[PDB]
């Protein structure tokens, strides 16, 4: 409970949480600023998408928490369920989790860059998640790379 790092089994969940909140914050800014709809997209200027992304990591992360599911700890919250869940779940929020999620969020900005993240956002929520979390070495990779 003392580490500021995200536990290893939770890195995929954390990555999906970050991708979801980056997408939400950019979409809300496109709406708030009445961004023009040209060519099927609403495109923020570079200063604005950079500011929105950089500040998204400073959000209140009290909507994410840790629960036990089939005897293993998992992180959940907005965006991490494909639909509503049939059964109640009890999760613990706060404590170390906001510091851990904000750290993960800020490090993804530096790893991929705001320009590249915004371009993936324009292709959709799924493309943003694929950029940050997918492919042979992402936190959500489904490939057992040969070693």
């Amino acid at each position: 409970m003392y580490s500021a790092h995200m536990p290893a089994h939770l890195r995929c969940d954390a990555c999906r949480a970050v991708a979801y909140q980056m997408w939400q914050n950019l979409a809300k800014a496109e709406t708030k600023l009445h961004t023009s709809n040209s060519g099927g997209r609403r495109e923020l200027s570079e200063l604005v998408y950079t500011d929105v992304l950089d500040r998204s990591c400073s959000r209140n992360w009290q909507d994410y928490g840790v629960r036990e599911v089939d005897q293993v700890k998992r992180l959940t919250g907005p965006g991490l369920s494909e639909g509503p869940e049939p059964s109640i779940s009890v999760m613990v929020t706060g404590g170390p989790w906001p510091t851990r999620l904000s750290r993960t969020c800020l490090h993804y900005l530096g790893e991929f860059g705001e320009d590249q993240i915004y371009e993936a956002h324009q292709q959709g929520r799924g493309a943003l998640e694929a950029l940050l979390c997918g492919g042979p070495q992402g936190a959500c990779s489904e490939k057992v790379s040969a070693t």
Side-chain angles (χ1 to χ4, degrees), residues 17 24 29 52-53 86 98 120:
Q24 283 275 284
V52 170
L53 279 168

Side-chain angles (χ1 to χ4, degrees), residues 37-111:
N37 197 32
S38 169
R41 293 181 164 194
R42 280 71 54 199
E43 293 177 282
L44 299 169
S45 69
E46 169 175 327
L47 290 173
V48 172
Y49 66 65
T50 298
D51 182 62
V52 170
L53 279 168
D54 290 354
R55 296 195 292 104
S56 73
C57 301
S58 302
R59 65 190 301 277
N60 182 336
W61 293 100
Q62 296 271 0
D63 49 349
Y64 295 84
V66 59
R67 60 175 183 188
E68 194 182 301
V69 178
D70 297 318
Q71 300 79 64
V72 59
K73 293 296 191 300
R74 299 290 306 275
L75 183 131
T76 202
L80 299 181
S81 53
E82 280 167 346
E85 293 179 357
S87 292
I88 282 278
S89 66
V90 187
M91 66 178 183
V92 177
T93 77
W97 300 106
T99 295
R100 285 177 183 167
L101 283 159
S102 188
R103 180 187 186 274
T104 293
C105 183
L106 291 162
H107 291 205
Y108 277 130
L109 293 173
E111 180 177 357

